[PDB]
Design a protein around this ligand. Structure first.
Ligand SMILES: *[C@@H]1O[C@H](CO)[C@@H](O[C@@H]2O[C@H](CO)[C@@H](O[C@@H]3O[C@H](CO)[C@@H](O)[C@H](O)[C@@H]3O)[C@H](O)[C@H]2NC(C)=O)[C@H](O)[C@H]1NC(C)=O
Ligand SMILES: *[C@@H]1O[C@H](CO)[C@@H](O[C@@H]2O[C@H](CO)[C@@H](O[C@@H]3O[C@H](CO)[C@@H](O)[C@H](O)[C@@H]3O)[C@H](O)[C@H]2NC(C)=O)[C@H](O)[C@H]1NC(C)=O
Ligand SMILES: *[C@@H]1O[C@H](CO)[C@@H](O[C@@H]2O[C@H](CO)[C@@H](O[C@@H]3O[C@H](CO)[C@@H](O)[C@H](O)[C@@H]3O)[C@H](O)[C@H]2NC(C)=O)[C@H](O)[C@H]1NC(C)=O
Ligand SMILES: *[C@@H]1O[C@H](CO)[C@@H](O[C@@H]2O[C@H](CO)[C@@H](O)[C@H](O)[C@H]2NC(C)=O)[C@H](O)[C@H]1NC(C)=O
Ligand SMILES: *[C@@H]1O[C@H](CO)[C@@H](O[C@@H]2O[C@H](CO)[C@@H](O)[C@H](O)[C@H]2NC(C)=O)[C@H](O)[C@H]1NC(C)=O
Lengths: 50, 49, 96, 99
């Protein structure tokens, strides 16, 4: 049976906060199609060849 | 109808593309739900209070 | 005697990959993250923050200072509770 | 929309019958635990931060930006006064420096 992810719990409280002290620079890619192949069909030769 | 199975074989491949299209539709249907809902890699829990 | 009528003519239905329980778990996880973190959980590690402070920052993000919330917290909570309660009455009505 | 995280900039690259984007993002890391308060009362007046949060390391109180730990002394130019000290739930007694 597939697992949805790792279990986690957030330590919520009346007066508590978390402030980061460092950073990381991340580079990710993304691919998107734009166009496809242009095609042409000749009826006379395809349907009635010679 | 055992004869009809032989007669339909004379029409080429009129069943492969239909099956492929339906399978693609089903795969896209699964991908839609995966895209919409599976957005978090962690399962958080609300506090008891 | 409706699904069988179509099934006996080679028309089947395949079950979805994700069950209802998994979708419910996803929604519950999203709600818990939103409540206990705000928007930090959507950009990396989740950082906890009190709800009132998060609401103050959300007000500050639309051009209203946070002292307004810190002075009208009770009224805002009452209004939100009434608005949420009205949604149940709206949905439970026959007018779907 | 443009990558995951806080977007900074993007670079385009060409692909056969398509296009590829390189997204540069900002990701925080190495968080720490702190105690926070919504407001600070000095002389019967409530002081709210301008563009920061109130944090404490256990003994003292500081004000810092919300996305990077950089504590600073609470000063009248960092806070603005609005109201008194009996309308805020969770106010904390402290002192505000006069520069
Ligand atoms: C914030 O995170 C960065 C990493 O993303 C920290 O920089 C890293 O600091 C450590 C220890 O100072 C470096 O390890 C040492 O590197 C030297 C390089 O010659 C090596 O000789 C040592 O044996 C040791 O491995 C690490 O290289 C460095 N990373 C980078 C990319 O420079 C930074 O210290 C963190 N900031 C704070 C305030 O913690
Ligand atoms: C929370 O942050 C405050 C920031 O002021 C810390 O207070 C400061 O703590 C440092 C470290 O002990 C003190 O420096 C020491 O000063 C004495 C006397 O000048 C010197 O003999 C030591 O060698 C050391 O340099 C600093 O004076 C002190 N500042 C004040 C205004 O009290 C506090 O320690 C932090 N608390 C925790 C739990 O991290
Ligand atoms: C922040 O500081 C203020 C004052 O600077 C604190 O106010 C305190 O409020 C209590 C209310 O119960 C005062 O207690 C008093 O005790 C006498 C004893 O006879 C009683 O007759 C009064 O009716 C009253 O109950 C207390 O005196 C007062 N502090 C001072 C210095 O006058 C406040 O509690 C501090 N903390 C917060 C979170 O505001
Ligand atoms: C801030 O403090 C909380 C509570 O003191 C930390 O949450 C605990 O983390 C430990 C990790 O070893 C768990 O074993 C505990 O069960 C957690 N407690 C609760 C109530 O959730 C939290 O990790 C601290 N923040 C950081 C950045 O360490
Ligand atoms: C602090 O947190 C608690 C729960 O996380 C808040 O709720 C209080 O919980 C205690 C514990 O039984 C009750 O005695 C109080 O009556 C609860 N408060 C209310 C208003 O119902 C609590 O409000 C938070 N703040 C303070 C100052 O305690």
């Amino acid at each position: 049976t597939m697992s949805l992810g790792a279990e986690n719990s957030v330590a919520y409280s009346n007066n508590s906060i978390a402030i980061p002290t460092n950073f990381t620079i991340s580079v990710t890619t993304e691919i998107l199609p734009v166009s496809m192949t242009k095609t042409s069909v000749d009826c006379t030769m395809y349907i009635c060849g010679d | 109808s055992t004869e009809c199975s032989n007669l339909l074989l004379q029409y080429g491949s009129f069943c492969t593309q239909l099956k492929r299209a339906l399978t693609g539709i089903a795969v896209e249907q699964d991908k839609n739900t995966q895209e919409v809902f599976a957005q978090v890699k962690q399962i958080y829990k609300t506090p008891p209070i | 005697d409706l699904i069988c009528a179509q099934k006996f003519k080679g028309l089947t239905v395949l079950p979805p990959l994700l069950t209802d329980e998994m979708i419910a778990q996803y929604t519950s996880a999203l709600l818990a993250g939103t409540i206990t973190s705000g928007w930090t959980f959507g950009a990396g590690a989740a950082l906890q923050i009190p709800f009132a402070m998060q609401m103050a920052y959300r007000f500050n993000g639309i051009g209203v200072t946070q002292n307004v919330l810190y002075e009208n917290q009770k009224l805002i909570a009452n209004q939100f509770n009434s608005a949420i309660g009205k949604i149940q009455d709206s949905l439970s009505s026959t007018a779907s | 929309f443009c990558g995951k995280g806080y977007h900074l900039m993007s670079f385009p690259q060409s692909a056969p019958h398509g296009v590829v984007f390189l997204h540069v993002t900002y990701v925080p890391a190495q968080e720490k635990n702190f105690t926070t308060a919504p407001a600070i009362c000095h002389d019967g007046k409530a002081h709210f931060p301008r563009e920061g949060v109130f944090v404490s390391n256990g003994t003292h109180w500081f004000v810092t930006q919300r996305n990077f730990y950089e504590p600073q002394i609470i000063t009248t130019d960092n806070t603005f006064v609005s109201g008194n000290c009996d309308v805020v739930i969770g106010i904390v007694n402290n002192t505000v420096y006069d520069p």
